[PDB]
Amino acid sequence: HHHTDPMVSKGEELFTGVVPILVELDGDVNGHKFSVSGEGEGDATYGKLTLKFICTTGKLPVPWPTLVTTLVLCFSRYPDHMKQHDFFKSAMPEGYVQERTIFFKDDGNYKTRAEVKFEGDTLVNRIELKGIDFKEDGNILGHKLEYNYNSHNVYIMADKQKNGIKSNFKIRHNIEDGSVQLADHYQQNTPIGDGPVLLPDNHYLSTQSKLSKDPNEKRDHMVLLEFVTAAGIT
């Protein structure tokens, strides 16, 4: 609402209230083609997301928790003293590309590319996902993961050469038998536009996610509440 840096003001202004979100994913995992649509709202003031996702092609062929990181970090809450480090909002409204490779230990990998940008007043995240080399009897295609999600801190670093950011981090998915399925993420983000962006000092994001079901919904779906806060600069 009041920042002495006009570049920060420009990005904050687009995220000042509740912003509607649309998520589209087209996926192919070991030749099972599927699509997911999601709708909800983001409130960057509190770092809060609320989304509901539907598999529009029938039953989702992989477990919903494996898609949480893939299915909008511009809604992170950056403390006032860290707002000059917020790459994600500084790239708006033209947006950014978010690319990942996700390696599931002892199993296959996801390769994702997403464009995150405004269409009018709506923040859209449009994703293509390709998954290969998964085991039919593994934890992913065998749906052995529990329907829950662990809190996680992720380290963000600038990539000055690409005018973007980079991160590598591990997600632990609980398996029904009490064990864990590791998912190693590599991520890079680059701006879509050619204007300047804020390139951050090293810092981390703290995330927490809660998964639930809509008791009146017959389609395969996931309801997601996420909180993300930046930290690590004193």
Side-chain angles (χ1 to χ4, degrees):
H1 270 183
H2 181 23
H3 299 101
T4 65
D5 182 333
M7 173 69 181
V8 170
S9 315
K10 159 184 89 63
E12 302 296 314
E13 157 162 12
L14 293 175
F15 291 90
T16 47
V18 172
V19 176
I21 303 174
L22 294 177
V23 180
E24 302 182 281
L25 178 146
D26 284 320
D28 176 329
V29 176
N30 278 35
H32 304 279
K33 293 176 189 296
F34 62 97
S35 295
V36 167
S37 287
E39 298 186 7
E41 296 180 331
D43 186 344
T45 296
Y46 308 102
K48 182 178 185 174
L49 283 186
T50 49
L51 291 158
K52 178 176 170 180
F53 299 100
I54 303 278
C55 180
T56 54
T57 51
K59 178 179 64 51
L60 189 74
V62 297
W64 284 108
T66 66
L67 298 179
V68 168
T69 50
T70 295
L71 295 168
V72 280
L73 292 169
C74 49
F75 288 104
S76 302
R77 180 174 79 80
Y78 272 75
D80 179 79
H81 69 282
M82 285 180 72
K83 281 185 181 302
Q84 70 264 50
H85 298 297
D86 190 346
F87 162 87
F88 305 103
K89 296 184 186 58
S90 76
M92 301 293 165
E94 304 78 10
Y96 53 84
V97 175
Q98 177 166 290
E99 288 161 325
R100 294 212 182 95
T101 301
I102 301 167
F103 293 96
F104 289 87
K105 192 151 157 54
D106 299 321
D107 211 333
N109 58 91
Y110 287 164
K111 280 187 209 303
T112 65
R113 189 171 181 279
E115 291 174 28
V116 179
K117 64 170 132 173
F118 277 95
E119 286 284 354
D121 288 350
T122 300
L123 192 283
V124 179
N125 179 26
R126 278 180 273 232
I127 312 146
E128 298 176 32
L129 176 154
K130 185 75 163 295
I132 66 165
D133 288 333
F134 286 88
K135 293 178 29 193
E136 305 267 340
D137 54 335
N139 293 322
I140 287 80
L141 291 179
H143 299 261
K144 304 182 179 170
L145 299 192
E146 299 187 334
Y147 190 70
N148 59 27
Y149 213 79
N150 292 309
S151 305
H152 182 242
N153 300 327
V154 56
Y155 193 54
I156 303 307
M157 309 163 30
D159 186 339
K160 309 295 209 99
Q161 271 298 106
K162 303 179 68 71
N163 203 34
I165 47 177
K166 168 173 165 156
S167 182
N168 160 240
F169 58 93
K170 295 157 128 51
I171 299 297
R172 281 154 241 283
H173 295 293
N174 286 7
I175 309 178
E176 55 185 5
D177 69 359
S179 197
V180 298
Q181 168 73 59
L182 219 184
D184 276 282
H185 287 58
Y186 294 82
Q187 175 178 327
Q188 58 193 13
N189 296 61
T190 50
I192 291 174
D194 42 58
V197 295
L198 298 168
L199 292 183
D201 290 349
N202 286 6
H203 64 282
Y204 68 91
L205 307 174
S206 183
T207 66
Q208 89 167 68
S209 306
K210 172 196 81 179
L211 317 197
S212 63
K213 295 296 189 183
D214 173 357
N216 302 322
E217 180 54 73
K218 312 300 296 195
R219 302 167 288 176
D220 200 357
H221 70 285
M222 162 176 73
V223 178
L224 176 66
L225 171 70
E226 218 177 78
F227 290 98
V228 185
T229 313
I233 294 175
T234 51

